[PDB]
Swiss-Prot record, chains A, B, C:
Protein name in UniProt: Excitatory amino acid transporter 1
Record-level Gene Ontology MF annotations: glutamate binding; glutamate:sodium symporter activity; high-affinity L-glutamate transmembrane transporter activity; L-glutamate transmembrane transporter activity; metal ion binding; neutral L-amino acid transmembrane transporter activity
The organism of origin for this protein: Homo sapiens
Residues at which L-aspartate binds: S295, S296, S297, T331, I372, P373, Q374, A375, G376, D405, N412
Intramembrane bits: 278-308, 355-388
Gene that this sequence comes from: SLC1A3
Protein origin, superkingdom: Eukaryota
Length: 426, 426, 426
C-alpha cells in the first residue's frame, strides 16, 4: 500500500489541488484564524478596535442572511414542482411519507439524546405549542419576513390575578410559516400538467440564479471565516469552558449520528425487508467511500446508481424516480443539535415546551437548505434566523463542520440507498 | 306538484349531496356550533380555556387574512389585463363606465339607508377625506401591506392653540392604495398587444394557482366556523341585544337589496331602454331560478346566454364581450352594509366624514374579491383588514350569509343581464 | 438669418407645439406657480389651509416615491442582463471600467468643488464609512425597502466611559444595498445564454410596463409642480437668502459641469488618443446641437451614429455595442451636487465622513435612474429617499432643471462619443 503512494508521489497535484481547493482553503483559514486569535490575546485592545477587526465576519454573516430566504423558498418551490412530475404514482407518496417518518424519528431521537445527556455545562409549554400552531400561518409573507408572532401577558383582564395571554409580535425571520406556505404553493403548482408550465420555468430559472449566486459569493468565505475566528477568539474569556463545551458538542453529534446510522436504521430495514444489511454495506462500500472522499451527494449520485445496479442486486426500474425526489425533499438531526446547543450555551431557561418548537423549526429549516456540499453555514443562518437567537456563535460550531459534512453526506447516501431498497421491496 | 316529488323520491340523492356538499356542511356546522355554544353557556370556564377551545376559528381567520392580499391583487391584475383584449372598442369603455356609475349609485343608496334607519342600537370629516386622498398612494407596496397613513395632532406648532395636523402611521392592511396601483398596473399591461404577452401568462398562472389555493383550503371551513361560533357564543353576554342587532342587520340588508333591485334599476332601465322590464323578468326567470338554486354566477353563465338568446330576444353579437369583462370588473353595497354595521356595533363615534371613506374602501374591496360562490368570508376579511377594525365579529354576519349569497348572485345576474340589454340598445 | 425666420413664420406651429409640449407646459406651470406664490404672500392664511392648498405637490411626491423603487430595480436588471449579451468580449469590460472610472473622477471632482467653494451660506467619519460598508448588505429586500442600518451609542459597556458603538436601525429607503443586489443579480442572469431566457423576458416586459407607467403618470406633473411651488413659496420666509442660495447652486452646477466637460475630459482624451479634440468637436457639433435642442439622448442617438460615421471618421465596427451598454450603465455629479446642497441647506453639521457616503449614494442612485428625458424629479426622489432627508426642497432645485437637463444631455453625448472614440483607439 505504501509503495503505491511512493510511486504516485510524482509532482502532479495541481489538478487535485484545484478540484478540492475549497476544503483546503477553508481549513487553512480556520487554522490561521485560531492561531491569530490565540497570539493576539495578550495584546489588549479596545471594543471599537475589535469591531473594526472583526467586521468581515459579520459582513459574511449579513450576506448569508441575505441569501437565507430566497434560497430556501425558491429551492423548495422547484423541488415541490418537480416532485409531482417525477413521482406521478402512489409509490412516490409512499416514499415521501417514509422519508418524513424517518426524519421525525431522527429529530425525536436527537432531542431525547440532548435531553438525557445535557451536552451543555403548562405555563409556557402549552403556550409554546399554541404559538407554534399559530406560527404556521403568519399574517402574510411581508410580516413573516421580519417578525414572528409571540404571545404575551398584559396582566389586566376582568379580584383578577391570572396569567392572561395577549397577542404580540417579536422581530426576526419566520421561516416556518414561509416554508409551509412554500410547500403548499409548490404542491399546487406541481399539480399543473400544462397550465403551470409557464410559471414553473420562471421559478426554476430563479432557482438556478440563486444557486450560482450562492456559489460565486462563497469564494469570499475563507477570509471572512478567518476574520470572524480571529475577532471572536480574542474577546471571549475563559477559553477552557468553551473548549469543553465544543468537545462535548463534538462527542454528542458524532455519537448520535453513528447510533442513528447503525441501530435504528438497520432495525427498521430488518423489520420490513427481512434481509441482512451487512451484505448491503459490503455492496455499497465503494459508493460510501466515494461520498466520504468527495463530500458531495450529487457528485457521487451516478456512483450510487452504478453500485446499486451491479453490486447490490437492485432492480433498476424503481431507481430513476425515488432517489431524486427523496434527495430534494440526517440534516434535520444536525440542525436540531446545533439549535439546542446554541440555546443551551447562552444560559437560556430551556423549558420542556420550547424543545419541540425548536425541533420542528430545525426539521422544517433543513428541507430546502441547499444543494451545495458545504451547506453548514447557510443552514446555521437559517435556524438562527428562524429562532431569533444571536448569530455570533457560528465559529464554535463551524470549527469542526468539515468532518461533520463528510458524516452528513455519508449518512445521506446510506439513507437514500436504504430508501431505494425499501421501495424496491414494496 | 307534490306527486312528482313523491315519484322522484327514490334513493338517488348521493350525487346531489356530493354536488352541493359545501352548503349543507357549512349550514350543519353553523347549527351545531350555535347548539354547542348555547349548551356550554352554563358551564363556567376560564379565558385561557376559551382561547384554547376557539383557536381553530382565529386559525381560519389567519388563513383567510393570508389569502386576502395575493388573491385580490392577482385576480384584479388578470381581470384588468383581460379587459383590454376582450373590450377593444369604445363600447367596452361605455360598459365599464356604466357599471362604475351603477355601483356608485348602489353604494350611495346603501350609505343613505344606513344613515337614515340606523340599524345599530370639518374637524375630522375634512381630515378624513384628506387622508383618503393621500391613502390612494401609500409609500410603496411593502408599507401598504402592513400599515396605512393616518393624520395626527402634535399640539406644538408656532399664543399658539390650534388643531395642527401632523403626519403619522397606523398599522393594518392598506388595500385601497394597493388596489388602485393594481388597477393601474393591470391597465398598463393590458395595453400591451405583444410586449406584455410573457408577463400576462405568468400572472394568469399565479391567478389560477391562488384560485385553487383558496379552493383547497376552504374544505377546512366547516370545522373552523363550528369552533368559532362555539367559542364566541359562550363569551358574549346579553344575547338578547346582539340577537336584536343581527335581526336588524338582516332586515336592513334584505330590504336594501330588494329596493335596489326593483326600484332604481328598473327606473334607470326604463329611462334609456324605454321598454317594459316585466317582460324581461318573464324571459329571464329561468336563469334567475338557476342562479338562485346553484348560487354560482359562473355555473349559470351559459344558462344566461341561452336565455337571453332564445327568450329575451337579444342580439347575440354584443354578448361575448360585455358580459365577461363586466363580471370581472351589488357586492359593494353588501360590503358597505357589513362595514358600517361593524363600525356601529363596537360603539365607535361614526362621524359623517368616515362614512364616505368606509364606503369607498368597501366599493374598492369588492372589485377583485373572488370568483368563488361563497366569497362572503374572504370579502369580510378584505374589508376588516382594509379598515383596521377587529375581525372577531365574523360569526354574527356569516350566520345568515348562505341566503345573502343567493340574493347576491341573483342581483348579480339581474345586473349583468340588464347591462347586456342596455349595451345592446346602445 | 433673420430673413429665414421671417419667411418660415407661417402659422404652422401646432405640430412643433405638440412635439415639445411637455417642456413648454412645465415652464408655464413653474412661472404661474411662482407668480401665484408671490401674489398670495400678503394674504395671511393658516397652516391647515396651506396644507389643503399644497396637497397635490406632495401627492406628486408620493407618486414619484412609489415609482422610485420598481423603476430603478427593473431598469438596472434589464440593463445588466443586456450588457452581457451585447458586450460578449473583453472590450466591453474595458469600456464599462472606463465609464466607472470616469464617473468616479466626476463625483470626486464635484465633491472637491462643493467642499472648497461652499455653495451654501474618526468619531463619526470612521463610523460613517463603516456603516456604508455594512449598508451594501441590508438584512434583506423587505428591510431595505423601508429602513437602513445606522450605528448608535448605548453608553453602557464594560470606570467605563467610552464611545461604544451599538447596532441600530433608521427608517427610510435603502437603495445602495438594493442597487448593488440588483447589479449582482443582473450580472448573474446575464451570464445565462439559454437557461435565463425565460426569466429575462419577464423582467424586460416589467421594465417596459414601468417605463410607460412613468410616462403616463408624468402628464400630471404640470399642475402638481404648479401647486407645490405655490404652496412652498408662501410659507417660506426671508426669500432673499433662499434666492441667493439657489443662485449659488446654479453658478456651482453650471461651472462644475463646464469645467468637467472642457478640462478633465479633453485632458484624458489627449493622454491616450494623442489627437486634437477640437476637430472632434467640429465634427460632432451637429449632434451636440440636436442633443441641446431635443434634450433626449435616445432621440439623437441615430444622429450621433451618423455624425461619427461620416464626419468624425470613426470606424463603424465598434459602434454597435460600446454605445448602448455605456448608455444603460455626468448624472452622478449632478446627483451629488443636489444631495450635498440639500444637506447643507437645513443646517446639518456636514462632517467630512458623510460626504463620501452621500457621494457614493448619489453615484449609485444615478446608474439606473430612467430613460426619460426629464428625469430630474425622479432622480431627486431617488437620492432623497436613499439619504433619508426631507423631500420638501424639490421646488428650489427643479425651478431651473429645464436648462440643467439640456446641459446633462449634452454632457452625456460628449461623454458617449469620446468613449466610443477611445474604445475605437484601443
Amino acid at each position: 500500500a505504501k509503495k503505491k503512494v511512493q510511486n504516485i508521489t510524482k509532482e502532479d497535484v495541481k489538478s487535485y489541488l484545484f478540484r478540492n481547493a475549497f476544503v483546503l482553503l477553508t481549513v487553512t483559514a480556520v487554522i490561521v484564524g485560531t492561531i491569530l486569535g490565540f497570539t493576539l490575546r495578550p495584546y489588549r485592545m479596545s471594543y471599537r478596535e475589535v469591531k473594526y477587526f472583526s467586521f468581515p465576519g459579520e459582513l459574511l454573516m449579513r450576506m448569508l442572511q441575505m441569501l437565507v430566504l430566497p434560497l430556501i423558498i425558491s429551492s423548495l418551490v422547484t423541488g415541490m414542482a418537480a416532485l409531482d412530475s417525477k413521482a406521478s404514482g402512489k409509490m412516490g407518496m409512499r416514499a415521501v411519507v417514509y422519508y418524513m417518518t424517518t426524519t421525525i424519528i431522527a429529530v425525536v431521537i436527537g432531542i431525547i439524546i440532548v435531553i438525557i445527556i445535557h451536552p451543555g455545562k403548562r405555563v409556557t409549554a402549552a403556550d409554546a405549542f399554541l404559538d407554534l400552531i399559530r406560527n404556521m400561518f403568519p399574517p402574510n409573507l411581508v410580516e413573516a419576513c421580519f417578525k414572528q408572532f409571540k404571545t404575551n401577558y398584559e396582566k389586566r383582564s376582568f379580584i383578577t390575578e391570572e396569567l392572561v395571554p395577549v397577542p404580540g409580535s417579536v422581530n426576526g425571520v419566520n421561516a416556518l410559516g414561509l416554508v409551509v406556505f412554500s410547500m403548499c404553493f409548490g404542491f399546487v403548482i406541481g399539480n399543473m400538467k400544462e397550465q403551470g408550465q409557464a410559471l414553473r420555468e420562471f421559478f426554476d430559472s430563479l432557482n438556478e440564479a440563486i444557486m450560482r449566486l450562492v456559489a460565486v459569493i462563497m469564494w469570499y468565505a475563507p477570509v471572512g471565516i478567518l476574520f470572524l475566528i480571529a475577532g471572536k477568539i480574542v474577546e471571549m474569556e475563559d477559553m477552557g469552558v468553551i473548549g469543553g463545551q465544543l468537545a462535548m458538542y463534538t462527542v454528542t453529534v458524532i455519537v448520535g449520528l453513528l447510533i442513528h446510522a447503525v441501530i435504528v436504521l438497520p432495525l427498521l430495514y430488518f423489520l420490513v425487508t427481512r434481509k441482512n444489511p451487512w451484505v448491503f454495506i459490503g455492496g455499497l462500500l465503494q459508493a460510501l467511500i466515494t461520498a466520504l472522499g468527495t463530500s458531495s451527494s450529487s457528485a457521487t449520485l451516478p456512483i450510487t446508481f452504478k453500485c446499486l445496479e451491479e453490486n447490490n442486486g437492485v432492480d433498476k426500474r424503481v431507481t430513476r424516480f425515488v432517489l431524486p425526489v427523496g434527495a430534494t425533499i440526517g440534516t434535520a438531526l444536525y440542525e436540531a443539535l446545533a439549535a439546542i446547543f446554541i440555546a443551551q450555551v447562552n444560559n437560556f431557561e430551556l423549558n420542556f415546551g420550547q424543545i419541540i418548537t425548536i425541533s420542528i423549526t430545525a426539521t422544517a429549516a433543513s428541507i430546502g437548505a441547499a444543494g451545495i456540499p458545504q451547506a453548514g453555514l447557510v443552514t446555521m443562518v437559517i435556524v438562527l434566523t428562524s429562532v431569533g437567537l444571536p448569530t455570533d456563535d457560528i465559529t464554535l460550531i463551524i470549527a469542526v463542520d468539515w468532518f461533520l459534512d463528510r458524516l452528513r453526506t455519508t449518512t445521506n447516501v446510506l439513507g437514500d440507498s436504504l430508501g431505494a431498497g425499501i421501495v424496491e421491496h414494496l
